[PDB]
Design a protein around this ligand. Structure first.
Ligand SMILES: *[C@@H]1O[C@H](CO)[C@@H](O)[C@H](O)[C@H]1NC(C)=O
Ligand SMILES: *[C@@H]1O[C@H](CO)[C@@H](O)[C@H](O)[C@H]1NC(C)=O
Ligand SMILES: *[C@@H]1O[C@H](CO)[C@@H](O)[C@H](O)[C@H]1NC(C)=O
Ligand SMILES: *[C@@H]1O[C@H](CO)[C@@H](O)[C@H](O)[C@H]1NC(C)=O
Ligand SMILES: *[C@@H]1O[C@H](CO)[C@@H](O)[C@H](O)[C@H]1NC(C)=O
Ligand SMILES: *[C@@H]1O[C@H](CO)[C@@H](O)[C@H](O)[C@H]1NC(C)=O
Ligand SMILES: *[C@@H]1O[C@H](CO)[C@@H](O)[C@H](O)[C@H]1NC(C)=O
Ligand SMILES: *[C@@H]1O[C@H](CO)[C@@H](O)[C@H](O)[C@H]1NC(C)=O
Lengths: 334, 334, 334, 334
């Protein structure tokens, strides 16, 4: 059954915990992979943790980096992981029928993204600008059988070319080049919402792009003080609810420490720095890191809306915690 | 197919052995988890052993405690366990369609129980009295699609608030607060019987509560000398057969050593100390520990009644043995 | 689909190799169980190797001995084995619907055989003569939904009571006590043949018993010089083809070394020591050990007859090799 | 659903990467098999890596060599491998219903190939010339329910007898002896193409044989300078596209180093040394080794043609990389 993704995003009052690997304690004696850049994606039946490896075990870009996956919450061991693809940069999602994965491998000056569908190579995209072809490093968004992704090529400290793609069963059917001067969109975190795709990216405040299934797009910055224009970096995410926005961020402004969720009822379009709700995901005394979003579709949840969820990488990579939104009572987590 | 649980409990003449992990011998060289608070629950297809971990392996409350599970009798290893939830206290059962799990995580003065259904967060209950929100640590009882649980909040040496809940597909639909002065109901072991729920709890003799699907309840103590009112502690269980009762207990009165089953034909309502049958589960020369009950429904057994079963934790935790009732000839086990 | 077992046994011209574990080399570094008394049994879908353990790993009667199993040819490791039952003596077979297992546990002077069906305890048999209740240590034979087994109780150096049982879905429905003075039937290896059960046992030459589904029985010795009456020991097997017999045996008469199959066209009823075909399974320079038979039913093979197969334990236990009959060209194995 | 294999071979413009085990880094600490002679074959649902073992783990002809398999890309560990057969030489393929495997075991002067179908022994072929019976060491080709293989018996430095077989459900139904003086066909790599079988073998330039389903055959050498007659060795492969040929080879002429694919539009029938496309699979500074082909049928890919793929063994054996053809843009791999 093909995923629809016509349903609006579910409203939430707070976030509750979903999963925690506990890999570092297990790998001190047992056999556990040293993982990097993990992300979570969900199918109609199960949620899984995808990660890039180097082939190294704990307590032991390159041609040897591969993409592997395990059931959410399981230890990423050589005896439980399922191979997906070869890549030093990768993304993945499910279209309701099978897994779609995208993996970039090859030369820095000639990288090729190999598109696989259900384990079979179906298509490839070659580096247009010949400068580190790279992708989302997160879940790709599927609406109506077709999946969408954002890919970049060029410099991480200047202006590089961006393209938005529409993929059907592993094939690229429609692509556009964005006209977005002075914008920087790396490591985009995307989710479906009422048949549209909304993405919040890393400006190396947060830029966003949104688009329809014909790849028509609009852009700007999240206006919230937590300018509607631009004001290094870390991957992150934000959810749009009308004019309100949920912004995930660290607690430190000089280091990647702590993590909190802030609800700003007018932050999408307003520039004020007022907010109503602040919940705590990670204490300021603990290291956090990169974060991103993923969703649980109605086909999986049994609900009439799309449930937003997110993950935080606790820094290679040591652990990956994740949370999902609820409309019931939840407390701050240290 | 939704579990019914209208069928009376099966009569038994004695108990026969079902399972034994043998984890300590295997973990001296291999990779085995250090487990705590195990319990057994059964679905229509399989029985599984649930346990709480700390993430530590053998021969190597907290934010890192998780609930995991393995097929009954298997070694609880990092390579075979299936993640369930995050909790320092937890319970679980199957409604005939999917798994329902309840897991309490967060602050001692602000704990939240996260209710999951088929891996998806569906609801949450927040600490009403702000004092160590805690649950059954056993199998929850499902009658007619809906599952029942007993949860407490307050002091373990005084009077705390109790609530009885009815959960449908992960949602709390009906709850009541018990009016039970001078009663103490911790770590309740519950089973379905003829559409009713019967629970025998820890008074820190044995108190019990029983209730219908509208959460109307009655209570008292097991009268058996093995008072109908009250006379520290350990989790345990007891089965009701009209006025007769099967009581599980240790052999020592000063220590948790040995284990025996005693059948008292008039013990539910009578105060005499006479019994007819005594079987031996654990020798007095061996350590025993916490115990509890679980059931095997007709949908699993092919029978016209519910088969009672129980487990004993052999003390963190080293091993978990279990037995089921039979009406055939069985001998004493040392 | 219930197994029929009406089909005669398949004729063979020689034996070809099926499986070999190679566990000793793998367990010198990895995690492998120390196994004892293995045997092979087949379901309509797969063949599996059953074994008894002590819970010990390599290169590290009792209450701790359990029955476990792995897919045929796989290493018997703690991470791949599936629990079956608790026993210091056990047998198993498949009825076409589920697994039936029989496991004897408890006191030497009060042993109970616990009958399980599809993981559920269904019945028990208690020691009639109170002397080491013990079973076949092989595959049990299923004809027409019902499975048959032979169990003994008493001395291994004198006369003990034997019983033949018919089990349906885990329940004992029909049993008989054999009147067999001066016969000794331990560790019987049984197979179905044209709706009848034929068993060749250990006399501690080879005695046999055969019976129908109403448990009517006949007995005698295999007459072959390789007397029709009696002439310590080892478990073994033999196949009946009219008046001809295939006898498995070691090559040494003073030690358990070597293994060969001998085809004697008139050996079932004749006392001569002439044979036509001798194939070699194990060289005389190698240790062999206990052996037994199992079968592959039409529901598994797609054939119109029952294919005979056998296994040899290479001596606790180090390795288990197995072979199946063919009508094509096969050579001697050293 | 029986595989058809009537569809022509898919045209390609270049090769993209599919899989890479990364076993050497994982086995330095964990439990990984020392593998030899790997090959890849695909079923309608999944692709798998088959290999021969000795039973030895990393960092620890014979009667102990077995054939085992794991999902493509997974580490070949004792805890994930699935047993197939006993052999010091073997081949395998899928007919659309089940797995067909062929395994040669026994004496150098009396070897027998045991044919298994779905785990059951169905037939055997005995050494006609009594000189190291040996097979393809690759995927066997299935067209229309029936599978084809090429087997040899005799000297590796002179003239030996060859036979072509047609196998249906594990049975040999049709075989022919080739009349091919001065030809040498060892370790043949075969693929289906438009209902015909085409094989390119090792001459210890490349000889080929092709045949129909009635086992009528034609032969010659690949004419390309990269003579139509003959001009030690290594296993390899080549794909035929009309008069054009894709030839895989190493970069060194004195050692097994590097790997490249060359497209010669007239190389099947022409003797010129001109080519149009050269892609790089392995750098000349890296060791390569044996290579071979396998295919992905329409039943697996969803396409209207057969997709060619190949593997390279990186030298016992350390790693196995594989690639599939695409018609999209792909770059050279170092
Ligand atoms: C969304 O799609 C489903 C499936 O086609 C349809 O039943 C439903 O009416 C649509 N509308 C929404 C937003 O639920
Ligand atoms: C969804 O896909 C179907 C099948 O291609 C198409 O007919 C339908 O119009 C699509 N809907 C949208 C929103 O594009
Ligand atoms: C119990 O429920 C089943 C299923 O609805 C029904 O067939 C049966 O009559 C009921 N009564 C009992 C106690 O068996
Ligand atoms: C069982 O559930 C069904 C469906 O909700 C309901 O109609 C029925 O009355 C329930 N029976 C009981 C015992 O509540
Ligand atoms: C055996 O049983 C099968 C299934 O009932 C039947 O079709 C067949 O005729 C019987 N006879 C034999 C010996 O094949
Ligand atoms: C086989 O079992 C069926 C069902 O019980 C019975 O009707 C039939 O007569 C049995 N046949 C034999 C050989 O007993
Ligand atoms: C190949 O076989 C399929 C299945 O029988 C058939 O539909 C098709 O027309 C045939 N022709 C080709 C070459 O596609
Ligand atoms: C394919 O097999 C079927 C069934 O045996 C047969 O009828 C058909 O003629 C075969 N086709 C070819 C190409 O041999």
């Amino acid at each position: 059954v093909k995923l629809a993704g016509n349903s609006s995003l579910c409203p939430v009052s707070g976030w509750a915990p979903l999963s925690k690997d506990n890999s570092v304690r297990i790998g001190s004696k047992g056999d556990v992979f040293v993982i990097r850049e993990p992300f979570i994606s969900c199918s109609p039946l199960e949620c899984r943790q995808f990660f890039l490896t180097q082939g190294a075990l704990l307590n032991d870009r390159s041609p040897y980096r591969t993409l592997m996956s395990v059931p959410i919450g399981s230890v990423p061991s050589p005896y439980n992981a399922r191979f997906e693809s070869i890549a030093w940069s990768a993304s993945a999602c499910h279209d309701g029928i099978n897994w779609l994965t995208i993996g970039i491998t090859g030369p820095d000056s000639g990288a090729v993204a190999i598109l696989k569908y259900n384990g079979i190579i179906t298509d490839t995209i070659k580096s247009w600008r010949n400068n580190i072809l790279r992708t989302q490093e997160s879940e790709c968004a599927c609406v109506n059988g077709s999946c969408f992704t954002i890919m970049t090529d060029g410099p991480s400290d200047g202006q590089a070319s961006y393209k938005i793609f529409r993929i059907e069963k592993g094939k690229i059917i429609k692509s556009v080049e964005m006209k977005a001067p002075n914008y920087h969109y790396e490591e985009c975190s995307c989710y479906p919402d009422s048949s549209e795709i909304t993405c919040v990216c890393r400006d190396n405040n947060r830029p966003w792009v949104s688009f329809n299934q014909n790849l028509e797009y609009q852009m700007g910055y999240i206006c919230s003080g937590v300018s509607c224009g631009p004001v290094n970096g870390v991957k992150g995410f934000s959810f749009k609810y009308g004019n309100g926005v949920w912004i995930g961020r660290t607690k430190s402004i000089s280091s990647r420490k702590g993590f909190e969720m802030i609800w700003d009822p007018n932050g999408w379009t307003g520039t004020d720095n007022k907010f109503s709700i602040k919940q705590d995901i990670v204490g300021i005394n603990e290291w956090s890191g990169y974060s991103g979003s993923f969703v649980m579709h109605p086909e999986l949840t049994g609900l009439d809306c799309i449930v937003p969820c997110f993950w935080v990488e606790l820094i290679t990579s040591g652990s990956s915690i994740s949370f999902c939104g609820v409309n019931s009572d939840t407390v701050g987590w240290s």
